[PDB]
Structures are given as C-alpha cells and as structure tokens.
Write a protein that binds this ligand. Structure first.
Ligand SMILES: NC(=O)c1ccc[n+]([C@@H]2O[C@H](COP(=O)([O-])OP(=O)(O)OC[C@H]3O[C@@H](n4cnc5c(N)ncnc54)[C@H](OP(=O)(O)O)[C@@H]3O)[C@@H](O)[C@H]2O)c1
Ligand SMILES: Nc1nc(=O)c2nc(CNc3ccc(C(=O)N[C@@H](CCC(=O)O)C(=O)O)cc3)cnc2[nH]1
Ligand SMILES: [Mn+2]
Ligand SMILES: [Mn+2]
Ligand SMILES: [Mn+2]
Length: 159
C-alpha cells in the first residue's frame, strides 16, 4: 500500500524557496508517529530541504542523477523506488510537489494536515479529485503557545 503524507497551507501551498516557512511542532510529531519504522520516499529537492536522514526510517531519494550520500538509498524511477521498499505493509511518500503528483494515482491513503495559514508559495499539493476519497479520521486543534496556527489532521482513504 502507498500512502502520501503532507501538510497544506491555504490554497494547497506546501513550500516556498525549498523550505516550509511555518513551524508547527504538533504536526511534525504527527509526521514522525505516522512514518516511523516505515520506508519514506522523497524527491531530491525535499531531501535537500530536510538536510539530513530521517532516523528510524528507510530513506529513499528519487533523482535522475547518481546519489551523493550512502546513508540513504537512491533510485531513478517510481517503480524502482517502490521496489527498493521491499515487502512492507505501507510505503510513505513524503513529497515534494513533483513526487506527490506521480504517486497520487497509486495511493490508497492520504494523511493531510490542513493548516490555517496564508503562505506565499511556489509548490502545491496536487489538485486531487474529492469524490475519490473518503474521510475516515479528522481531528481539529486550535492554536496554542507552541503552535501558532490552528490545524486539522485528516486521513482519507480511496473509495
Ligand atoms: N508541506 C509538506 O508537506 C511538504 C512535503 C515535502 C516537501 N515540501 C516542500 O516541497 C518543495 C519541494 O518540492 P519540489 O516539487 O520542488 O521537488 P521534489 O518533488 O521534492 O523533488 C523533485 C526532484 O526529484 C527527482 N524526481 C522526481 N521524480 C522523479 C522520477 N520519476 N525519476 C527520477 N527522479 C525524480 C528529480 O531530481 P533530479 O533533478 O535530481 O533528477 C526532481 O528534480 C520544498 O519547498 C519543500 O519544502 C513540503
Ligand atoms: N504533516 C506533515 N508535516 C510536515 O512537516 C511534513 N514535512 C514533510 C517534509 N519535510 C520534513 C521536514 C522536517 C522533518 C522532521 O524534522 N521530522 C522529525 C520531527 C520529529 C518531531 O518533531 O517530533 C522526524 O523525526 O520525523 C520531517 C519532514 C513531509 N510531509 C510532511 N507532513
Ligand atoms: Mn521503468
Ligand atoms: Mn514484493
Ligand atoms: Mn493562521
């Protein structure tokens, strides 16, 4: 099974200038819980944005060029990325925009955080078709001293 996980600001913005400009510790904790002990697939730009391997997960990087770091696994196509995960119950695709576009048609589950924040961005989550997806979990949180925007954790499953 393939799942996508992402955090979206208003208008599906996910990034600006190869960064995420907000800081929501509760959402990063949610990301860790839902990805730990699973393989994670990311594009090269997202690898550069994170800047280091994510511990406790097999890190798989898509790039058309040879890898530059043997602490992670480098692959050159979607099918190779999937194969490199092995026989696991759930593969997590962690972006960015280009990678999400390619894996969305193959995904059964979306883990989406909707953040109430207006962000100028240059990267968006794909325009997916709402009719294709059932919401099976949602949990709203108001802003607090640690998290400066309200946010909504949602899990959707392909109908
Ligand atoms: N809010 C969130 O949830 C979230 C999550 C992830 C990322 N982001 C943000 O998203 C932005 C990065 O997204 P992005 O769309 O620019 O880039 P991306 O999807 O992270 O990386 C694209 C790169 O991945 C490689 N690639 C993708 N598909 C491939 C394929 N089929 N075969 C081979 N290589 C492939 C290519 O690398 P080469 O050029 O080396 O061939 C391509 O240039 C950043 O702003 C980041 O902060 C946000
Ligand atoms: N919901 C969601 N939020 C995100 O921030 C997110 N980020 C990415 C890509 N970028 C990043 C950037 C940093 C870390 C990170 O530092 N993660 C630590 C945090 C642990 C914690 O704060 O509790 C990790 O071990 O996962 C992960 C992904 C992909 N999907 C996402 N999905
Ligand atoms: Mn091929
Ligand atoms: Mn197999
Ligand atoms: Mn806000």
């Amino acid at each position: 099974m393939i799942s996508l996980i992402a955090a979206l600001a208003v208008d599906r913005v996910i990034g600006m200038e190869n960064a995420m400009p907000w800081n929501l510790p509760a959402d990063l904790a949610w990301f860790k819980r839902n990805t730990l002990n699973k393989p994670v697939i990311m594009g090269r730009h997202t690898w550069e944005s994170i800047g280091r391997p994510l511990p406790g997960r097999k890190n798989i990087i898509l790039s058309s060029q040879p890898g530059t770091d043997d602490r992670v696994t480098w692959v050159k196509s979607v099918d190779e990325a999937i194969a490199a995960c092995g026989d696991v119950p759930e593969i997590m695709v962690i972006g960015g925009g280009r990678v999400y576009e390619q894996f969305l048609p193959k995904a059964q589950k979306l883990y989406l955080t909707h953040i109430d924040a207006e962000v100028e961005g240059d990267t968006h989550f794909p325009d997916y078709e709402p009719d294709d997806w059932e919401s099976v979990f949602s949990e709203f949180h108001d802003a607090d001293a640690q998290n400066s925007h309200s946010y909504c954790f949602e899990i959707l499953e392909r109908r």
